[PDB]
Design a protein around this ligand. Structure first.
Ligand SMILES: [Mg+2]
Ligand SMILES: [Mg+2]
Ligand SMILES: [Mg+2]
Ligand SMILES: [Mg+2]
Ligand SMILES: [Mg+2]
Ligand SMILES: [Mg+2]
Ligand SMILES: [Mg+2]
Ligand SMILES: [Mg+2]
Ligand SMILES: [Mg+2]
Lengths: 50, 107, 131, 63, 92
RNA sequence: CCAUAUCCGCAGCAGGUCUCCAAGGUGAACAGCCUCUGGCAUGUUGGAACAAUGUAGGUAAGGGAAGUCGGCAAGCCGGA
RNA sequence: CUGGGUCGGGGUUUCGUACGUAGCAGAGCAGCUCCCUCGCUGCGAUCUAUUGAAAGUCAGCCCUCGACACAAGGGUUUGU
C-alpha cells in the first residue's frame, strides 16, 4: 500500500531548509527468504554457460 | 437423509451487481437456480409462484437485498424422467433478517 | 538566492484579472507572459509571482491603448506548498510595475501571497496583510 | 507539525489533509473536505447541522 | 513509532490495507511510487552506480506517520482517540 | 380487411392513402406527463461478457472564442 | 497445514438523526360541554425526548473460527 510522511529537512542553500515537508511513500512487505540450492557458471566466447 | 428440507437466507445484492435496469430481477431467478444446484447436487429445480411475486413486487429495477427460502428434495412420485430427484423452492416472509442462521427443519 | 518551487498555473492568455492598486485601472487583459519558450498549440499560462505583459480595458484614457507589465498576487486555482496545504484566494488580481520590479502605485488592497512577496520585495513592503 | 481545527465544524486536522481558503477581506479559514466547504460557501449556519460539535454543545448533547 | 510521537501504534491503518490484508512482518518504506498493482511481487536490487550527490548522501529522521483509513476520508489516527472524542454509543 | 400483415410501392417494406365517436387528474388548453374502458407482447430470432472505433444522450476544476473560412454545434434566457 | 465456500457477528466507512410513542412546544380555529376555551373529539404544517439514530457496507475492503452442508469423482492423450 501507500501513505504519507512528515520529516525535517537539512538541505543547505534552499528555501525549505530547517523546515518540515510532506511526502508520499510505498510500503513493501518482506519476510525472510530461504536458501535451497546453488549454481555455478563459467565464461566462454559465446557468453556464459550454466 | 436423502429426503430433507432446510432454510436459508440469500444476499441478492452481491449476485446481481453491475446489471442494467432491464435484467436485474430475471437474473435473480437464474442465480437462485444456480444456488440450489450447487447446494443440493440436483440439476432439476422448481420454483413456487409466491416467490416470483415477491421478487417482482417492486418492478424490475429495484429488487430487494435479502430473502429467505426453503429447499426440499423429492423423488419423482408422479414423474419418470431421466432424473430421479428434484428440488423445490418456497418462500418465507420475515420482518427482520438479523441474527438468522441456516437452521435444519425436521418434519 | 533561493528558488521558486513550481506551482499549478491557472491564468491562460485571454483573461481579465482585476487590479488592486490606486492608479485608476479596473481590469487587466493579459496578452503574454515572460519566460516561455513553448510548444505547438499550447497556451502560455501564468501563476503567482509570474511577470506578464498586460493592457487595460476599464479605467482612465491616459492608460488605455497601451502595454504595461504586471505581477500576479492572488489566484483561484489551488496550489501546493511544501507543507502539504492547498490554498486559494477567492479572486484573481494583479498590480502594475516597471521592468526592474518597482511598483507604480503606493497601496494594495487585500492579501498578498507569500510566494510573490519573497521574490519581489518592493511589493511586500506596501502590502497590509500577507498569505 | 501542527494540528488545526476546522472552521465550519470543530473537527481536527493532521497536516496532510484539507484545504485552506482566504476571503479577500483579509481572513483565512481551514476546511477539511468538500462536504464542509460547500456548506460554508452556501451560507449555512453550523448550529442546525446536527453532526457538528457546536450543535452538540448547544443542545447539551452528551452529559 | 517515531522518537517523537510515542504512541502505541502500528503501521497498519484502520480497516487494514485495502485489497491486501494485514501486515505482521518486517517491511521497508520507499520514497515515492512504484510499478504494479497491490499484492504484486517486486525485486529490489542494489545500485550499479556510485552515489555522490547530496540528494542521495543525505540522511533522514522521521517525525510523523499517517495511519488514517484509506477506505474513505479518514480523520482519526487510532480507535482510542475515536472513542475518547465521540463517547459511548449504543454499544452499551 | 380499411392498415408499423388483406390497398399502391416486385415483398407481411420505419413510406404514402378520405372520414365519424372521443373519459379521470395537473394545467389557460384536443400541449406534454401518469391512469380506467377496450387492445398488445416490443415489431423478420435468442443466450453469454462488457475490449477498440462508432450512433444517441450527459457532466466537468481554473480561464472563457485564445479554436475555426465563419461562435458551425452545444449551452444561457424561458410561465404568471 | 484438514481446506475452502454460504449465512451470521464484529472493524472501517457514506448520508445525516428512522417508524412509533410521549410532550403543559406549537401561528390559530370553529364543534363539544364539566364553558372547561389547557378539559376535550380534536383540526394542525412544523419543533423537542427516546436518537451521532435508522438504512447500506465486496459483488475486485479487513478479521473471525460461531452455524450449515461439501470435499475421491469424471473425461482425453503422452515412450529414450
Ligand atoms: Mg494550431
Ligand atoms: Mg482509498
Ligand atoms: Mg409516453
Ligand atoms: Mg422478441
Ligand atoms: Mg411487422
Ligand atoms: Mg471548465
Ligand atoms: Mg481567431
Ligand atoms: Mg489560428
Ligand atoms: Mg445555433
Amino acid at each position: 500500500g501507500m501513505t504519507h510522511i512528515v520529516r525535517e529537512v537539512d538541505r543547505p542553500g534552499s528555501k525549505v531548509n530547517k523546515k518540515e515537508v510532506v511526502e508520499a511513500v510505498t510500503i513493501v512487505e518482506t519476510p525472510p527468504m530461504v536458501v535451497v540450492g546453488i549454481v555455478g557458471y563459467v565464461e566462454t566466447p559465446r557468453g556464459l554457460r550454466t | 437423509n436423502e429426503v430433507v428440507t432446510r432454510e436459508y437466507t440469500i444476499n441478492i445484492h452481491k449476485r446481481i451487481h453491475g446489471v442494467g435496469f432491464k435484467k436485474r430481477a430475471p437474473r435473480a431467478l437464474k442465480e437462485i437456480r444456480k444456488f440450489a444446484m450447487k447446494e443440493m447436487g440436483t440439476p432439476d429445480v422448481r420454483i413456487d409462484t409466491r416467490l416470483n411475486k415477491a421478487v417482482w413486487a417492486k418492478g424490475i429495477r429495484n429488487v430487494p437485498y435479502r430473502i429467505r427460502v426453503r429447499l426440499s428434495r423429492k423423488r419423482n412420485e408422479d414423474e419418470d424422467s431421466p432424473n430421479k430427484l428434484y428440488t423445490l423452492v418456497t418462500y418465507v416472509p420475515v420482518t427482520t433478517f438479523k441474527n438468522l442462521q441456516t437452521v435444519n427443519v425436521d418434519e | 538566492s533561493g528558488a521558486k518551487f513550481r506551482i499549478s498555473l491557472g491564468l491562460p492568455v485571454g483573461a481579465v484579472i482585476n487590479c488592486a492598486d490606486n492608479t485608476g485601472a479596473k481590469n487587466l487583459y493579459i496578452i503574454s507572459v515572460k519566460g516561455i519558450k513553448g510548444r505547438l498549440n499550447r497556451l502560455p499560462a501564468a501563476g503567482v509571482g509570474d511577470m506578464v505583459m498586460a493592457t487595460v480595458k476599464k479605467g482612465k484614457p491616459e492608460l488605455r491603448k497601451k502595454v504595461h507589465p504586471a505581477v500576479v498576487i492572488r489566484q483561484r486555482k489551488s496550489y501546493r506548498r511544501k507543507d502539504g496545504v492547498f490554498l486559494y484566494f477567492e479572486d484573481n488580481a494583479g498590480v502594475i510595475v516597471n521592468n526592474k520590479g518597482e511598483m507604480k502605485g503606493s497601496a494594495i488592497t487585500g492579501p498578498v501571497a507569500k510566494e510573490c512577496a519573497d521574490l519581489w520585495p518592493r511589493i511586500a513592503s506596501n502590502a497590509g496583510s500577507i498569505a | 507539525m501542527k494540528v488545526e481545527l476546522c472552521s465550519f465544524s470543530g473537527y481536527k486536522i493532521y497536516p496532510g489533509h484539507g484545504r485552506r481558503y482566504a476571503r479577500t477581506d483579509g481572513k483565512v479559514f481551514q476546511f477539511l473536505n468538500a462536504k464542509c466547504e460547500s456548506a460554508f460557501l452556501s451560507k449555512r449556519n453550523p448550529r442546525q447541522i446536527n453532526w457538528t460539535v457546536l450543535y452538540r454543545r448547544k443542545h447539551k448533547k452528551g452529559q | 513509532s517515531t522518537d517523537y510521537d510515542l504512541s502505541d501504534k502500528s503501521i497498519n491503518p484502520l480497516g487494514g490495507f485495502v485489497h491486501y490484508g494485514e501486515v505482521t512482518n518486517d517491511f521497508v518504506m520507499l520514497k515515492g511510487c512504484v510499478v504494479g498493482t497491490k499484492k504484486r511481487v517486486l525485486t529490489l536490487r542494489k545500485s550499479l552506480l556510485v552515489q555522490t550527490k547530496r540528494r542521495a548522501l543525505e540522511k533522514i529522521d522521521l517525525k510523523f506517520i499517517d495511519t488514517t483509513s484509506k477506505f474513505g476520508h479518514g480523520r482519526f489516527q487510532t480507535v482510542e482517540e475515536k472513542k475518547a472524542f465521540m463517547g459511548p454509543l449504543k454499544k452499551d
